[PDB]
Amino acid sequence: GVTKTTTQQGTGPSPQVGQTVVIEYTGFLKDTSKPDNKGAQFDSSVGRGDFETAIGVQRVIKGWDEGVVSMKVGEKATLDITADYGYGARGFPGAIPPNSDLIFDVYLKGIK
Amino acid sequence: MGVTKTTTQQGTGPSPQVGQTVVIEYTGFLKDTSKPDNKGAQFDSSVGRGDFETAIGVQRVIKGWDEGVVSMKVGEKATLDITADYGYGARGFPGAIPPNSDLIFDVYLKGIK
Numbered sequence A: 001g002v003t004k005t006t007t008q009q010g011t012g013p014s015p016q017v018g019q020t021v022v023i024e025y026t027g028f029l030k031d032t033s034k035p036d037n038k039g040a041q042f043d044s045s046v047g048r049g050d051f052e053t054a055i056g057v058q059r060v061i062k063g064w065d066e067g068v069v070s071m072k073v074g075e076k077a078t079l080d081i082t083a084d085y086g087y088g089a090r091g092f093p094g095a096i097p098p099n100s101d102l103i104f105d106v107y108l109k110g111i112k
Numbered sequence B: 001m002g003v004t005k006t007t008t009q010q011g012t013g014p015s016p017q018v019g020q021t022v023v024i025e026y027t028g029f030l031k032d033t034s035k036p037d038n039k040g041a042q043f044d045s046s047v048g049r050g051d052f053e054t055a056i057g058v059q060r061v062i063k064g065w066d067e068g069v070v071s072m073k074v075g076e077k078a079t080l081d082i083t084a085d086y087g088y089g090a091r092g093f094p095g096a097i098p099p100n101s102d103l104i105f106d107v108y109l110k111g112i113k
């Protein structure tokens, strides 16, 4: 469903269901012909500011819910998220095509 | 209930029925009742690019569009006031649509395949 790659190990606490996480992130459409399978960037907190959400309660795609609760504060990770754990067959109009596997760089900076 | 349609240009072409592919031009806003026409931040628009083509009425888009668009005629422009229940519900697209966001869409039905 979601495959994680740790590019920086974190050692703080690991978010649990219902906690508000603070993350920096960049989202990419998956393109296996590209380095690290990163195709077009569709979204990013960078510049916008750190993104906050309660995790594990389906306020974001399942791939984030599942990926981010497996992280530890301080961890930088890449989440490879299959379409059905992302925006599935519907996609998101204007942003993400139907059935798009997704690649996210996620930086877990804290828990509220 | 969840979706109220204000027709802003009457259309006279055919009307979609469930499962037909529709071709629409749209602009999406977060609803903001302290703004004119209830239109808060614009998060998306197909104006100036390709139309959005989709089967209508089969939950491939938010229910507000499934109900709203099938009540339209080709050529019709309409403002769709969509509650969270008929929009993306309790999920959000980060940076664009918070969870449980009411939505306003300007929709323009330009064809049925």
Ligand SMILES: O=C(O)[C@H]1CCCCN1
Pocket: A052, A053, A054, A059, A060, B091, B092, B093, B094, B095, B096, B097, B098, B099
């Ligand atoms: O833009 C926002 O506020 C976020 C909240 C968490 C879910 C996604 N949308």
